[model samples]
Target: TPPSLTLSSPPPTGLPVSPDLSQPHSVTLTCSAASPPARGYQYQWQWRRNGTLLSNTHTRFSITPSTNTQSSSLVISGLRYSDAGDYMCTVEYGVCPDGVDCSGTTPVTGNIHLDLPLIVEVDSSGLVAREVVVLTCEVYGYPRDSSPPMWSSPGRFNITPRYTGTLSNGSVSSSDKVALSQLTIFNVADEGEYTCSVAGESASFRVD
Candidate 1:
């Protein structure tokens, strides 16, 4: 008999706004076997994000089933704007004879989406005159870390721009792919309009 796998804790649909950035933001997904009384059968689980296979190695997520159980759960913590995607779970099992590793059977699949839109935020406003001012564009997207936001000023203030490389977002292996755009002015000379945009979304700020 095959173990009927199903999603027990389905995540809510996403939105166009940023995630709850306060802290301890998380989602828990549970997998359970519903048919034939989920016992005497071995359980194996595989997790994925946006169709990409994942492991417990990522500090942001956890897959649990230390021993053997009919049910398993995935905990994704520290939720951020980037933590949105199609999360999938696969459950597989094979009934083997006397101590032989079950080569594994066809997996039962379940998935959910964290659909989201893009947004850009200007981090500088209301500055002090004659002092060095840093204007930051924090751009986040459906998958988090979209392209850097374009910056424009009235040309009265010289703008120096800098980028936070992929290294700043995640491990060297898999870049967080996050982008931070920083535009700096040596001195707050004029209070003018500055606009930053990305992914067809734009926001403006004034420096005074």
Candidate 2:
């Protein structure tokens, strides 16, 4: 039989919006011990894309946000669309608080998902000035992510665009493939339309 581990949140569903693809994304996952005579416990966070290892990556996600937090919750941010997928947490414990005595320690695990779904559109409002129209860009990707498209215009102010959900070709990607998107315009300036860009081997749009 398998040892049962406890969790605070089962898993998160529904898509979201984020700033960019290669930015940090924060998420809190938990692993609790049973009511048995379990002792000292430490946690290890494991990130997987499709079915590959993604945690223990220092440069990508930093676990040490601060001290005094013993919840053993992993905070991962600065996420790329590619960094979206399943995240698993495992807790280990010993009989005593020393933690080194693993003879009595038990283990438990849980999982979560980071999705990347993005779309871009032109916010066509009867705007006269170059700083009135604020672009509302959004993306429905992993880790509840979205971001408005922004661009540098002729005027001093930047321009932002709007976005909604769009259907994209489910490309021939790895089992561990995730998606990410970005926006770069605000306070509209130039007199031209725009589009949203995503993270891929080449810039691809989720449009027909």
Index of the highest-lDDT prediction = 1
Scored by lDDT, model 2 comes in at 0.38
Q: Residue 67 deviation, candidate 1, in Å? A: 6.1
In model 1, how large is the Cα lDDT of residue 56? 89
Q: lDDT (CA) for every model shown?
A: 0.57, 0.38
How do the residues 78-148 of candidate 2 rate in per-residue lDDT, one tens digit apiece? 44456555666544442235424545435555565545533332233344374343433333324223332
In terms of TM-score, the best-performing candidate is 1
Report how far off residue 175 is in candidate 2 (Å).
32
Residue 136's lDDT in candidate 1: 72
Per-residue CA lDDT of model 1 for 3-85, tens digit only, reads 34443433233222223332225666665554333456666778888668878888988989635555677888656556666
Candidate 1 residue spans exceeding 4 A from truth: 1-5, 9-42, 48-62, 66-68, 73-84, 92-107, 114-119, 125-127, 131-134, 139-148, 152-156, 167-193, 199-201, 206-208
